[PDB]
Structure 1
Amino acid sequence: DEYALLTRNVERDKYANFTINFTMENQIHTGMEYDNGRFIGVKFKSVTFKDSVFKSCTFEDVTSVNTYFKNCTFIDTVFDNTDFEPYKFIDSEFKNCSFFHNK
């Protein structure tokens, strides 16, 4: 007792109500929250998401290579016509998410 655990409770950078097409490459994204984000026709090349939250997002017509989601959370999110196999999701959680047309 008396000696407590030192854990940062840091709020996530929040981005919302956007559409993204750019085939973004070679990136790392940590502590991010994407709300009502649309990823349409996106080539993820060598990108990773760490401790990020996706809420009410759509991935549609997406491809990914050397791309991973580590300890992320997905909520009310649709993956339509994507190439996302489980192994791309490390220690992640889905709540009320939909997958369609997975190649």
Structure 2
Amino acid sequence: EGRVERDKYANFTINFTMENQIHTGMEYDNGRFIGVKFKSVTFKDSVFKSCTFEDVTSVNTYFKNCTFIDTVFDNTDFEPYKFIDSEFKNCSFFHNK
């Protein structure tokens, strides 16, 4: 997972199912979520810096009051309704037609 500071994870790759979890108040620097299936996962009050979400699907998954900075969403299923009161700063969104 790459826990480096009190408040953050860094330089990690997740490429496995994430299921039935709630994460609050964490920063994630240079996180790579590659081919991940999120299932009933909530991130709350979290910061994502220079992360990559790639080929991810998600069910009952929410980002609540999260900030995304310099983050890339590449072929995710992340529609607007995945986010509640969230903030994007210099973020890129790519998807196949």
- The equivalent of 2:21 in structure 1 is 27
1:83 touches 1:102 (CA, 8 Å); kept in 2? no
Which digits, 9 at most, give the CA deviation of each residue in 1:57-90, with x for residues without a partner?
Answer: 0000000000000000000000000000001100
C-alpha change, 1:52 and 1:102, in structure 2 (3 Å) is farther
Residue-by-residue CA offset, 1:11-54 (whole Å, 9 max, x unaligned) = 96200011101111000000011000000000000000000000
What secondary structure is seen at the aligned counterpart in 1 of 2:81?
helix
Contact in 2 for aligned 1:71/1:91 (Cα 8 Å): yes
Higher Cα Rg, which structure: 1
Q: TM-score, normalised by structure 1?
A: 0.86
Q: Identity of paired residues, percent?
A: 99
**Residue correspondences, number:** 95
Contact 2:11 2:29 in 1 (8 A): yes
Q: Verify the 8 A CA contact 1:82 1:102 in the aligned structure 2.
A: no
The aligned runs of 1:1-103 (5 Å cut-off) are 13-101=7-95
TM-score of the two chains, using structure 2 as the length reference: 0.91
Shift in Å, 1:102: 5.9
Once the two structures are overlaid, the 10-residue window that deviates more, 45-54 or 93-102, is: 93-102
Residue 22 of structure 1 aligns to a residue whose secondary structure is coil
Cα pair distance change 1:91/1:41, threshold 3 Å: same
Flag structure 2 segments of 5+ consecutive residues without an equivalent. Answer: none
- What is the DSSP-based 3-state SS (H/G/I as helix, E as strand, rest coil) of the residue aligned with 2:77? coil
In structure 1, runs of 5+ residues without a counterpart are: 1-8
Q: CA RMSD of the aligned region, Å?
A: 2.9
